[model samples]
Target: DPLQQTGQLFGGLVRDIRRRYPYYLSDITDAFSPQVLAAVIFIYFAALSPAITFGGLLGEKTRNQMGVSELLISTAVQGILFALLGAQPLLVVGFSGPLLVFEEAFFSFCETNGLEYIVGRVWIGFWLILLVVLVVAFEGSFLVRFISRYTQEIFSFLISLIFIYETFSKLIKIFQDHPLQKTYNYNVLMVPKPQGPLPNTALLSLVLMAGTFFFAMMLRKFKNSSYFPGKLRRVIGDFGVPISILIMVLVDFFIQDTYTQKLSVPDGFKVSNSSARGWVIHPLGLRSEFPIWMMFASALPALLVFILIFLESQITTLIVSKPERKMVKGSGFHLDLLLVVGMGGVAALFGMPWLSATTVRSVTHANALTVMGQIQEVKEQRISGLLVAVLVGLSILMEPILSRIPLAVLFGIFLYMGVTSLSGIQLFDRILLLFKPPKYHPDVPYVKRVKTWRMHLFTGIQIICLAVLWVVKSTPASLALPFVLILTVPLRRVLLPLIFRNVELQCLDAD
Candidate 1:
């Protein structure tokens, strides 16, 4: 059916390139319109940059391997290429829960099998490209139309849960990450007592976490409040995250001797265009060293990654492109998948961690850029270029400044992002319905469409699936997590009809 629908390969390739020609018109910047404001706003919104770095650090720490410097360059290059070459704007790729999970599994496979990880990764890269070619040739993105908002919500909410969970887990470990966090006041014989089991370092984390969270929330609330001028309100909200980051930074700075857990950035970075993990890294060196059979076996995991990237990217694009947002651009389902293919192949070789268009960050990126009003118009293509340019500069020349940023602050920002994204997930809201008096329940659309019990059944099943996936992810058996996620689609489509009528499924799952 896919080949039948898509027809010939050359025809489809040419057709897609021709269709994307119009989007490039907006990439150019006019003179003096610096987009300096966009860069500042996005720098804070680039939460995933730190998030991915920390994630790579985690995998390395656990497996006893290091790739932080190479990962940074890969990130910069990925942002640059995707911004220049991708079809979707505001689609930021960063640390993915499943991909992160898969990496650990792959690393473990290498250890137990006495195989070289570099060789395995290169073979997987080859298989991923092959899979990409096959999928694009057959037009697989069209199959995603069968997945309704029901599945999208489940997957998106799962991604949000991952972000929130990762944040809290890191936050709780702050005391441990910086065990001794106390210091004397400026020229005073006074130092504040520690906050319960934590020393000054952890106490500062606790304070900043709340300071950033509450202040930013209220600041955002101020944006919508009628007391403020509407334009000013939006400007406040648009810049809220950065302002929150700076506020926390200053408070930490002014306080006397305290041991804060900062991000681990390499000092005085250098690069080689000819090296394996450089601006133009060597590819396929590992393939030549590995057994030929390893190439074929790598396909299984590569297939898993292809599905992971495919579904996550497509679902995010679908969610972000909701008509209510008044986004003028059309969906680039096929083109974005092709971009990830290019992304995966290159990243795999360079020892760079793979990232996907995570729901939390991409939505935050879009929402931040949106002009707050009834009709939504966002800074589109130029934002990525300018935003990524800021990242490149920060990483290249401003390494010391980037290094000084507190990990706790970023976690607090992560928490804010996770909580903010919950508005889109109706399941969380509906779960609250269990507590409310039926007579005074809020007028949510899902409530009006389906009977209470039926809605409960639908959402309950989703929660169970979410819980199962989460459990799988945290365990040694996590290699199956991606497969379970894929299984949810078929279960929603096939098994759902046996239990509920088409109308109920339609109402419950409507986007």
Candidate 2:
């Protein structure tokens, strides 16, 4: 009986592939449209900027054994594979912050325990591959059926908050690190030993950051403004992020020569640490330093890594393929996991970073592909993601140009991203409803059907959940973040119904 159930689940995976396989040609063919071309340009910067940013931080954690090139290559390779075969071509993949936190913790553990980090990681990779295979063989993704908007909304809100927090945190650090003179403000006796490192770096950094944010915001609104023709407005809206990025790039260019913090990119395509061996990391090679028994010890951590990947991958899949996006092609959650398995195996062997469907980036990708209205029109296709992957791979050759883009500019773009992704989240809308006067509320179904106190009650609960997640993620308790999110499913399914009427729950929490 168990074997038969497993077989039936495997058959479902086959059926998902079969449903999407027929559209393979049209997905590619539809990509030749103008809107798709614009989306490629938009998402390329969105994807690439974060890879370099996170890669730098990851490099610090791993002592340069894994850095920009590793992330770029993994992103390129995985994006290509997912775009080519994934049931949902609109979904974008990349290295994520939670995965980064895992890697940072694992590396610290290895350093403390006299273990070779890469070798231990590779062993974990082996378990990851086996676990993924087992999960897909059964129906692990079907578990998503139990996860409702109550769970998903909180997770999405946490991610957006992370982005916003990172922007402010980094900007604050810049001020603290490059602090202004105490006496310069008094100036009664004239400046004592003029500001070293010239060009008022902190001031310039803030200027660039705010400039990118405001200009992008202004351009993004052009789509709804009456000043521009319909075609031009749509194009402007689609290209808003990319255009703002370029403007700041040129501004920093004219101001010239590292007045602000610039992007940290390696000199070439080679590994960050040239002293080490080539790309492929031999799991057995590091066994020489310690007993081979220590190698199999990776399964425990690997189990956690597998859980993170499964939850991250499937939740993102559900978010993008939501009916609100008007996606016609069905999803292939099992096949997508299989693709991640193959990439994870190769990434382990090559000492590259692992990737999954990053929430913020994939949401941005979906928004970029969509034409907004009551009936949303999504340009669902494969080319934009394919091109984004190719461009990132080629970034290995363009380090000099990339290095000129100021780090503040990218953060500003990230701030924009964090804000933009929140626009579609109904929970975010409900949260805002708590502040506005009753007369100013929008004419949405929820506002009309649901009482104000009922809406506020639901919003208050989500804020509490959000606060808890932020605390957990920021603390060492991040290891339990996914488990915490999983807890929300039962909380909503079992506990909340008693608090609210069925009709009220439907209006407030429907998928």
Candidate 3:
């Protein structure tokens, strides 16, 4: 009986994959509809493009041998590959936050151990491929079922908060970098004196961040205002981040006299060559020696990296393909993540930084092209191969102008992304009830029908789980972050059920 059940598992999985074939199998007519074209541009400019560029910036910070140009080129190339060869074309792949962080940590390991970073990365690449093979054999790569909405909320909360924390992190750095250099005596400048109030530059930074956050939140909160037409309401709600960023940027130029930080795009019109080598990086670039023992030893971290890659991609797909998003196409968790491993190996060969499906970008990418229904479900996600083609075209055309946009605004967009996704998280939604007047809260079976105190108890438990994840992820021990997250799935599946009955969890954890 046990062996029979095991065999049936994969047989069922195969049948599921058959149901969600790639776009090539779908009706070719909607592939090029004008509506799809509009989504490509909106997603690219509003969030995806900037997010990829931001990912590039984050990569460059840790010397991972990637640049904005290379990232664009990589996303354009690999995104199309996934669209065609992979199962879920709607899931856009690009620079993932967790993957970038792991790469940065790996770079530090190489630096500390007297190994050249490229050489170390190359060896790790081999191990990563091996791990990918293992995951596939065990069905462990992308289809790990330990993740639930509870864990999903935990991880998504971390991602959204990463963006939010980055905004303040920069704001704090500005003051630390520049003390008030006031000359009390006209000729005498203090060398290192602290100004209680911020300098003009630092002050401008706060104004830009706060104003942008408030402005964007306002747009999001009131997007359905009676003043707007039906179509206008949808557009404003869908594309408000770009609109808010533009408004904040205009204010920076006209209302403010002082200059603030901006996107550090090189002052060139054409795409610049990577400061490294060609599209494919040979081991010739590898400078350090890796012995047989060391090579095998490095696989330990490679195992961890594979876990991060799997969860980041898998959870993102779960979020995008949630029932409320109105996606018709089914999920391709195994195949799409198999491509993440495949792409990782490819990036290692080319000495390119690894990539994965970004949550907010993929979500925004879907929203840009999505057809929402009246209530619970309707319509489909029509993302096509052409979206990547358009992305490549736009990157080339707008390569020069991108760097000119205010980085402050991009960071502001960063804040918007972190805040916007919170609406989709039910744990967070219920958590807000802690402060809300119970009478005014929306009707959910858990809150309205059940004892109000039980809803509070539900939210309290979620907070404890969220706090454990948040603390673990924020510390230097973040390398184990994925494990702790994966651990939550069992806790939800096993432990939580012991505490709450089916009816209670159904109401509390319902999306």
Candidate 4:
């Protein structure tokens, strides 16, 4: 009776495979088509740009326990594995802000408390995987259905803001380090003697960042212009970001005597913190050093992280598999969580950072696959995601070239991603409407049906909530962000109905 109540243990996962398996061969064979190749190139840059940027930030925050190498490796492995086996190849997996913040808080907690980070992480990994599997077996992913568009927009907006904020913070740090004038001399005892900040390094880095953002932004609109043939214009637009990144890198390369900061990739396939830790982290190796109960204590953090994962993984997957995308392959909520389980487990052992669905990159992946809104045509296939991951893996071998990429350029890419994703968030649109006159407002059912005061009230509530999340992530109390994020669901469902009539709520909040 209990078994029936829970349904078959693997029913959801089995259905995912059944829905997708018949298309497996076509998923591969279609890679040779024109659309798949272009999508691969576009999505590769889209995925890797943030992977590198997030990796660099994670490296700084985690003291190099996990960095670019770990992110790239996870992207490569999970990308390929998911493409081949995942029900929804449309969802691109990579580094994310929530998981990044969680790792920073968790690592600092371990370091200060005198518990070994690697050891604790291994136990956390074990619990995380176990929790994911349990969720899958119980078909818990269906619970995401209760999550409204209101919550999705808020969470998605939070991620976008993080990307933009991080870009600004990194640029500010550059200026702080390379001040206009050197205030004091370096240590005289140094062998080579510090050169101090290079002349115009900060200025040049800012230029590169702005240039990258401008080029990518402008070229993305090239498809709508009348300058070129239709197909060529679309092709140019699809590859816009990659082209922008390449052009800026060349500009930095050609400039004489200006020393912009370069990407700090470790040489070869070595660990970032080679001196402190190794590739394989043994959970029980520290048994005698710490209390045995510490292993179980790791689950509390793991449980919190799993809650974040459930929201992130399912919400992003839902965005990609939305009816608007016209994806025929199917959804893989259960099986995809299993992929998360595998990625987290392996990353733990290797002392790498954990990865899961990233909202921006997943949406970008969806956009790249969409041929035309005019036709509602999309070329859905597995090969692009597969090849994209493989290229990221292969980048490890090209360290010399990889190292040549300037950090500013990647920040520019981050700015581009954050700004680009801001489009289509109904919340942002609503915010814009607040300033514009009512008569000139864009014709939408929400604006027409919902009272102006009611809509403003709803938007005001969202803005306040957004401000809280922003401040929460910045403080030492950031570990509670998952709880704060989870609370928005009930807030939307309960408080929203009391404020607006059923039809009014539908116009403003319906998916």
Candidate 5:
């Protein structure tokens, strides 16, 4: 029981620390100095931004339908799942954007259609989740290969691109509204022009992020060195973003003060006030103002949302827990499905946001704790799970401290972590094709024509398709094109042969 308790406590503690420490330090750094202050600045903004709206909706729903006890139950269930079957223990499970989007859309549709959609949607989601659970129970982990590496890479790349875009966009707004001025009494800093496409502050942030990643990779690569022990190396790598932020804050404090032009800090930019503290609970048995039909209508969009979340969550877990790489002992399909579905249902009941697996943070934690290995052993996973649960439990008290940590620092860390995530992509294959002449192997099937031509051809087509879909999602007719492509997998049997006829020809020729 003590071991189990410790394991749970450790899991929660690590994850919470990973999430909050950057904020906590950022706040302190901002108050005392300007070193990587931007990192903290970012976190401060992210915490207060109107963008974090899940609580209000949950509160409203709880007041109307669910009671306080039910709300707490849902949150507790979520915490327990994170403690137990979470594939990547470092990931903090919580409601996400897609789930909210689906819920809102469903709520609207039901209101318009006069249908009891919420119940229907919940039922559908529950069933779908159950279906996924059953598949996983039957050893669906093998099906992960069906999602080709290329597709996975593209999806990840797209997500990273989104992160970059969102980060820069927000920073641009901050710089545009805030002007630069210098004061002899305090410190002087130069800020970029309002209309400029990119701000100097942002550029520095990017550099810090890149630097954190570079250092992290170095530490991992030379992990055998005595100076940088395994645990230390991982901590450095895991906290790379936070560390980078600290560096930047220090740089800003020392250098900016010497300049005549001073940077005007944004309102609410101070770090100490930023803290993720307190738990709000709404009881169950509260009724919804809208008809049950509305909830049902929400199900359609919920289904799509669930699919995307499920796909991303599982894929991210697999990648982080890949064999021989680092961070072994991830959750399998059965466990993950149960966790996701169970969490989703609980979230709906309590009007809480649906939780999903976060790849970057989870992987970063794994790396920090030195949990890397090729294949995940069950015992190792159990240990990791316990640690994560403990971390989550500790977060209740630590959240406030972490909230003070800066965003620029986290961004820097994020940048590094993201870059590291991309290491899995096989650049050599492309390079070999580009630089070297092709050597034909007679014994290999389709060596002369199909394997060479068809393989490249299909790859190119897949890329093109993914790109088009990515672009389409941003347009007015925005719909998820990736899901469409995923759905096309059923046709692979018929399509593969038709597209690669040359392979068949070569086979016939050999015969």
Candidate 6:
């Protein structure tokens, strides 16, 4: 409740400032426009195309007995985050790998700990949040630095690993029952006999996905030249995936009869006539059967998931809202937290899934609107709102079109998205390498540092912890081991100052 109130106050303050400063409006608009547009286009195509949809399965029911309800809850939670706390205007929210993994761990934790204990843990987390809020409010933004680049990179790397594994696993399952084939590559598991004649639709979908990935990459790489108009270049580049999907869909429709005879089904392949043919508003009505303990169990890992999601979402917002790009006053931390929590609560009540702030969709919206060179305070919020509203409205009518897109295509799109997201990590790594170490002035004397093998020992511990938790997918406990290691880092900070008497003496001498 305190967190919610804080967020509300924070949001209101920013809005108030913008309302009073009309000149700042244009700048805000320009900064965010491109990012919003790019994000929207990616997410829209992802939702529609099948290539990107496999990632959604971790959030949905899988053949391995993973229930769809968990996905529903996670989605609702992410939606709530987007609808409320998301600072970036026009960003779409959805489930992600890290959040899903956290949810799975939480679910397992709840199963192991019993309902009452699990609820107790939720209360414990609330108390922890209260402490965090007090610290944040009093100390301001100083703690953001304590969240190190190394830590963030490690967390993201873990998530990437999960994405790669899950994607491969899903693909493998699609051909699991096929006949035995000659082994290929380093992995014997790579080769599977055809279960049925390879479907023409699946092959076509792969082609479309590949085309989009390549075209988007190429356009992004080359479209910034002086010879090309920047706006036109961007429009072509941003819409590449969607356009590719559209062309393939049309071609598939026209050529269906020609390849129908060539399609085969393997012995175990049971073809279901059941199709996701039409739109049903509120397709799955409100689910009231959510076990309270189970829901509470979800909240702890949900909290960790929320942290990562919030960080990425807000960073994306900051990138879009920069003064040189799309100028806009961004939402503050408290407001975002309030919005996310409120949305989560609402989603919980309604049996809907939570959402996260989406990077791709928001960028798409920004680009489509050509938001540039203006103060954010002067621009109408209604412009972006209206665009998003249109997309949501169109989704209802376009469900058939969305459903018709093959899963293989969506998988390919997701593979691309994962790759795109990884670019940030690569950039950071490169930048860090380029940075020169700080050189001390001749007048400033520095104490010699002691080299300790203990640092490697600590790193080794972290690696082991990460590997174990990742493999086991155990909840709060899985996190417990790594967190214990994190505690040592801070403990070192505290003790290092005291332990290094010579450093203290040097400081005293300087003073």
| Segments of candidate 2 deviating more than 4 angstroms | 1-9, 182-199, 287-292, 373-375
lDDT for each residue of candidate 5 in 1-511, tens digit (9 for 90 to 100)? 0001222322323343344334433322323322122222322222222122243343343222222222223433564666454443444454444444455555555557654433444455555555555544444444555654444555555555555565566455544543333322223232342232222544454454455456545645654345676666644543444444456556545544122112122222121112211122222112334454533454566557666667767666655555545432333443554566667655654343456665554444444434334422212222333333333333334544444433454444455555554444442233234344557333444344455655455545555655676676665334365476465444344565575574553442221
Give candidate 5 regions above 4 Å deviation: 1-80, 86-97, 103-154, 164-289, 295-298, 317-331, 362-400, 427-456, 476-482, 501-511
- Candidate 1 similarity to native, TM-score: 0.86
Best by lDDT: 2
Q: Name the lDDT value of residue 119 in candidate 5.
A: 46
Better of 1 and 5 by lDDT: 1
The C-alpha stretches of model 6 lying farther than 4 A from their native spots are 1-39, 47-86, 101-142, 156-169, 175-206, 225-231, 251-328, 358-396, 424-428, 431-511
User: Which rank order by TM-score, best down to worst?
Assistant: 2, 4, 1, 3, 5, 6
Q: Model 3: runs farther than 4 Å from truth?
A: 1-17, 22-39, 46-64, 141-143, 175-199, 209-223, 232-239, 250-257, 266-279, 283-285, 288-290, 370-399, 437-441
Q: Which candidate model has the greater lDDT, 2 or 3?
A: 2
- Candidate achieving the largest TM-score: 2
**Model 5 lDDT, residue 480, Cα:** 60
| Candidate 2 pairs with clashing backbones | none
lDDT of 6 at 64: 21
lDDT of 2 by residue, 1-511 (tens): 1111344757546867888899888888887666677778778877888898789888877888788888888888889888888877777888888888899998898789868788777788888888887777786767777878888888888888888998899988887656765533332221332244333667788888899999889987886676888887877777788789889999889874445766655667778766654687777764456457776677888888888888888888888888777887767877887778657866877888778888888888888888775646787888888898988888878778877888888878888889998887888898888999988889987788888888888898888888888888888879899989888888788888989888888888887
Native-to-model Cα distance after best TM-score fit, residue 410 in candidate 6, in Å: 2.6
Residue 58, model 6, lDDT: 38
Instruction: Give lDDT: candidate 6, residue 368.
Output: 40
| Candidate 2 to truth, TM | 0.92
Candidate-wise lDDT, in order: 0.67, 0.80, 0.64, 0.78, 0.44, 0.42
- lDDT tens string, model 3, 1-511? 0001233334423543566654444634555544465555545554444545554555566563656665665666677677666656666766765666677787777668766666566667778887776555555533445466788877777677766786668667776665567832233233333333334766676777777778777765555565678777766665566667677777776745454655543333223345544555554343344556666786887777777777788888888777777766666666677677778767776666567777776765665566543334422333554465456535656645654456666666666666766666777777788889888788767776667777787778777877787788778787777788888888878988897888877777665
RMSD after CA superposition, every candidate: 4.8, 4.2, 5.0, 3.4, 11.5, 10.1
User: Candidate 4, residues 1-511: lDDT per residue as tens digits?
Assistant: 1112246886778877777789888877866755577667767766776787788888888878777777777778888888888888887888777788788888888878878877788788888888888878888877777777887888888877877887899999888877888454544232332256545878999999999999988987786676898887877877777788889999999987677777555567777777777777776764336558888788888888787776788878876676656766677777888887667766776677677888878876777677764537667788888888898888767778866888898888778878877876889999898898878788899888977888889899999999998888888777677678778999888987887888988899876
